[PDB]
Amino acid sequence: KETAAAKFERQHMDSSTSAASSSNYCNQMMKSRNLTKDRCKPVNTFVHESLADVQAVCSQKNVACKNGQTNCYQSYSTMSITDCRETGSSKYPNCAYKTTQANKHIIVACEGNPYVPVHFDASV
Numbered sequence: 201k202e203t204a205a206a207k208f209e210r211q212h213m214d215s216s217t218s219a220a221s222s223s224n225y226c227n228q229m230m231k232s233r234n235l236t237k238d239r240c241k242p243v244n245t246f247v248h249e250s251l252a253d254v255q256a257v258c259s260q261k262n263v264a265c266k267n268g269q270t271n272c273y274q275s276y277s278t279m280s281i282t283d284c285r286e287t288g289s290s291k292y293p294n295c296a297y298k299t300t301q302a303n304k305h306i307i308v309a310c311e312g313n314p315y316v317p318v319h320f321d322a323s324v
């Protein structure tokens with residue numbers, strides 16, 4: 201199968217690139233990470249920092265999750281990220297996205313033991 205932690209890495213981690221996401225970045229990544237298999241995932245964020253730095257967020261600023269749960273944490277430092285948003289003319293299976301790089305504090309939900317990220321909640 202695939203653990204929730206593994207799914208988070210597949211859907212949100214892209215340490216390789218520093219911050220040079222091209223205008224085609226999201227179109228390629230959303231497809232390569234299998235986020236356009238059953239349908240076009242509407243919105244998704246990729247984080248370019250190291251796995252160690254992102255996992256460390258689970259021990260940082262505790263903030264309320266959008267769903268009301270209390271297992272969300274905000275990074276003290278800003279992080280290099282890329283937001284992907286499906287375009288209006290996007291039509292599955294030909295999923296199309298707008299790519300936008302940014303440097304913001306990320307908010308992730310963490311679970312388990314080890315306590316690691318399992319959901320990307322927001323960036324601020």
Ligand SMILES: Nc1ncnc2c1ncn2[C@@H]1O[C@H](COP(=O)(O)O)[C@@H](OP(=O)(O)O)[C@H]1O
Nearest residue numbers: 211265267269271272309310311318319320321
């Ligand atoms: N506080 C929380 N703790 C754990 N999982 C959460 C959560 N808030 C939302 N989720 C869920 O975690 C999954 C991962 O989210 P994301 O893909 O945005 O990282 C989503 O479920 P689904 O994938 O079943 O919709 C989402 O609904």
